[PDB]
Symmetry: T
Subunit: 135 residues, 12 copies
């Protein structure tokens, strides 16, 4: 399948998951140090163990969208629609803090659902599908 | 809430929440005239079981109508609905309510059962709308 | 409504594997023509086929429904730019993906894949695909 | 024993939805005559009907079995004073209750309704009704 | 359906559940204060939170039977048969304390089973079906 | 236990408990002659699986017989049985035992699977009897 | 390979209850000849038979498959020295054991019996038996 | 139950849960706490986020503040509470509780036990229960 | 394990469960307690009620009385037990335990923690386990 | 069925479970006192309650094999093959300590699986099927 | 590991463990040439799902081959396989791998789904082999 | 969190879990403990047995030894730890823990509470967590 595809003035992205190394993002360790403090890493062992994977995965998904979108000539505010899949909606507050770092001005249109699982296995906690309006 | 991109309008998934802060959960949360319309029965056991979903569905569809009115269109300009359920057994109720808003020809439709929607498990139905309005 | 044109795009209702002439859910290799069975990967061994037949046959009906729906409107698989694909069991993905390759020889679509609980009309539907077409 | 008179009362065995001429469990609108389908609320839409058909058809077979059993003994639905009604899923109640209204136009019976785990012969039976008749 | 129906010398009642206001009885608060002390309310927060709903629901069901029966010209000792449905038989001791307040002399015939659910939803913990012998 | 109301006698639901204080749970809790009758097999695995329900069923039915004798009737005056099971898979065993007490024509019958009966989960079968004895 | 001789022993593949001429899983008394039904313990009562029929019929097909497989190689049930027997529900054991008695009138085999989760081709197979034969 | 009890230089609290001593209400979200305490627990103003984080934040705060007020009614301050035993229905809630606990121990935190149990009184909607021990000569 | 232990003015008990130190029996109902203690726990004489309430009442009593007897073997009385930690398999059992606890603290009750856990030693039939702390100069 | 059967130079045993008195072995109490210390009984109440049933059942199964095998003229080292069924593989360390008492020299060939249940009910934790090579 | 008894050789149940101390769990734990052979696809989602079982199956079968070589035979001397799965849905993958080791005529076969094998739940397949080698 | 804390003659430890203060690793089997400590926990050398017993033995040892080392950093020895509260995910693991605890209290064991809870920090792979109280004048 195609990372993104252009159709008229719209760009459709595939659903994107937190993978790089072939690994699945699973904690702060997987992300650049400046970003950690930016996601809210506290330095406390137990707090970072819990919040870390969701924060890291959410960042990785959102940054991959930003890169994929740019590599087609757009910026984050060209994204009209987000469809967001979770294994656990109680993770939403964590996702929402990260999404704030990518949409500081006008937020995209949003669909948010809890599903069972996504590819390639159950450790994926978040998948985002993006739609871009860029003539 | 909504956004224009060329001739299309895209809506956020709408959930049956009062914008009371509360989740709609029964005939009492909808105006008297419409209860009769959703198929309210009067009898207590029946309306206890059907009322949450009918009310929730109507709430969501009407929210969609109004948002589309406030953008220039009516319901027939809604061409694609993505519809999320906690329980597909509710679908017959939902399809009854939707036939109220599309009496002629329905839109393109997607229907899946998912686990939960925001903001909690009492929400039985979410609809995401796509409008074509040049 | 099974499809609707808006501008350059055509939108398809989500498609499930229904035997459109018996009103029942496709359930195995018996629901597909003999030479298509070889194509889907049928092996001839009772148990292998009992196990793969449902997802493979269901995947064929969905994708071939999409192909025919698009063919009839003048378009092609390469015009079907986007697929949203709902599974009851992601373990069926390799099977589904073997079939999807058959339908997209040159221009693969953009893809989203999730496991949900269930689809219409009941729990024996294993795969559902929502297709989006760009055809000026 | 499907029924037994004791004094003024007649007692019926609990009744399940069995196709009495094929020995199988009623499973949808196909098991009922076409004009009765409209009466039960069939809509013509594939998925709505797939979902309501079983409980509605099962409810019809049970209630119509009771009606016929009572008719044959000289009585009427108004003589069927008491019903005990067992469900696998109380969410089916609105459907069942739509059908029960059909059988009781003037004198509704006394009613008990519970969700139990299961009934004979297997888990596809959705509804079972025990009827009690007063007929001097 | 019919609250009760007369057939010869017998009166059949419908199964009765704890509803009034359209609410489902769910604690001591739903019952008259003299009755609370009578059901065994302790005044302790945690004890009353647990015992309360079952005690209150049981009383409400039994009193509705007493009223329905009287409104047909009988008293509690005219009830021959009780069929009693529970979501949880571990609630039986609570039910049994209340039933003692309605049958102090000779107890009716009894059938007692745990079922899954009753109408109109899962918060109903007790439903009683009564049969009356009253020529 | 039982009560007269006109020509009918009504019985409390009977459970398979010794009136030892204990729940009957196997062939050992029933007299030697009847074991052969319930279909006891001699082999250990089989009788371990069938014995609880056969014994329990027999215990309950016999309790019903005696209560009906102590009121003037025999089994044929029992016209309606309501029968509660923890597991309908047990029904075939139960139906075998019941055919012992109604060799000719069975009574009017209701059969459901419920969750539990008193006084705990080891009780597999409860029967409520209704007698017609003018 | 359904069987293989090595020296004096013949080894059988595990055997499941498949209707070998319709490719489907045996499911009740209807899958067995009428006089064999009496032998298996059919009672004529709808619900008793609905409940015992599957395990009894499945047990007959498995054991009779073994008998025929062994008969065709010159041997007998007394030559079938060892059985490994897999169940989905050990509560079916008394039924299975009633049928196994039929096949072993003089020299019963050595026996292992376990409850596992599942067998091929799907979850409706209730019983599977692996047989080992000593036939010089 | 005794709210607290002295024994030598020690004061032992009963395990505390987020219930109104008045209403008898279980604390269920932001609406049950002082307005500026909300943005102090990290409320965002977003409906869905606040619905998800509200209950654990509110209950934690309510419990921790109870401890404070109780400790006050015996002469001591938050910093004399040296031991906490903290019981959760769901340890995924820990980061939320930890945010709140920092607000009460800005300087040096107490000794700490944290376990996930099945349930606390009076029902399953109670997400956190803390037991406090005080050293106060 | 040490039944109890002194440390300054304090005596700490091991968590106690309803087992016979003799038989090795787990207490399972009324039949395991002194006859007049039965109607003192609220036995009704009804078979089914007593089967349902018997085990929690009997186990609670057995545990609480153990505490008493232990506390006695060190010179103290029930009223010097100032802290209890109480562990349940099922908090729906709380009203039963609370009835019993009143019988041991008729005057002023102790400091109290109550949680529902999954299991206690030696098996799942143990419904209640109490841990006691004593102040006794 | 047949406790064991001879076929050429091989002896097949039936799967064997811990039964005597018709009871199912369920603790140290069911086994001879010298053996208890030999299985690792500590004397501590809680330890013996947990380890006891698996240790006792494993011993009973293995000793019954030794007796059945001897009663056909062989010794434990005539057993070539063990097939071992468990309700819970976390019991394996306990089984393995006991098996060491029966195979001190060369261990038999081994198949080990967790199954759901065995005959006659769920309290059986171990069943062993043995195969003997004894011309 | 194995034992001779007359003309037969009996093998211990083999599990897919490296003798690294680790459980094999994906294509990466098998040599490049064989990945192509097991049906490795290159695409990431597919190979993530098929790779554990194919790798595990191949690991187990090859272990069997080598053990049989180190005793004088080849694969065709393996006449009976007992095959244990955590999930029978894996069987098609397993049957593909096994067809690699028995290209002509398969051996006598037993296939059940069990709960777990040693040493933990990540092991998806265990095979017990019986060899006939005079 | 404070590792330990003094209050009068008492020292209270935070509940301890089997994590490396260095790596941040959760202890998962024999490979995480000193080699001769393995056969001291009862390692057999068998692959399958050691895989099954390794994690509980290793985690118990790691936790108990932490307690020791901590107690040392305040001047006391294992025998001044008079109270332990021990939390398990699975009490079937108790015999393993008990073996290990004997190695630290060869003479007279401490006061003891043992319960099965659902989970401990930081995740579900933690099988045992012990809380220690010390008397040390
Ligand atoms: Ca949730
Ligand atoms: Ca469903
Ligand atoms: Ca069933
Ligand atoms: Ca219960
Ligand atoms: Ca399956
Ligand atoms: Ca509130
Ligand atoms: Ca609860
Ligand atoms: Ca006892
Ligand atoms: Ca347990
Ligand atoms: Ca396990
Ligand atoms: Ca490690
Ligand atoms: Ca967790």
């Amino acid at each position: 399948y195609a990372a993104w595809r252009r159709a008229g003035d719209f760009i459709f992205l595939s659903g994107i998951i937190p993978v790089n190394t072939g690994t699945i993002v699973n904690g702060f360790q997987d992300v650049p140090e400046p970003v950690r403090e930016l996601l809210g890493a506290t330095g406390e062992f137990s707090t970072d163990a819990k919040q870390g994977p969701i924060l890291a995965q959410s960042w990785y998904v959102l940054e991959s969208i930003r890169r994929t979108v740019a590599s087609a000539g757009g910026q984050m505010s060209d994204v009209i629609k987000l469809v967001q899949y979770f294994r656990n909606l109680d993770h939403f507050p964590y996702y929402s803090r990260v999404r704030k770092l990518f949409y500081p001005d006008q937020p995209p249109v949003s669909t948010v659902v809890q599903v069972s699982e996504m590819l390639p296995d159950a450790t994926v906690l978040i998948e985002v599908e993006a739609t871009v309006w860029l003539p």
